[PDB]
């Protein structure tokens, strides 16, 4: 789960997902955290 420090990171992730489609390089250029668990950190939580 693809857990953005933000709202605004998220937003940029999926923005990621246009060009730089597969998850990872999102993860590599937005700053968030592919994480093994179905929900997001208390600090990572859009």
């Known amino acids: 789960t693809t857990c953005c420090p933000s ?7 999926n ?11 999102c993860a590599t250029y937005t ?8 929900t997001c950190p208390g600090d990572y939580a859009n």
């Open 7 to 13: 709202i605004v990171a998220r937003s940029n992730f």
């Open 31 to 38: 700053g968030c955290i592919i994480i093994p668990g179905a």
């Open 15 to 25: 923005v990621c997902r246009l060009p730089g489609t597969p998850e990872a390089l």
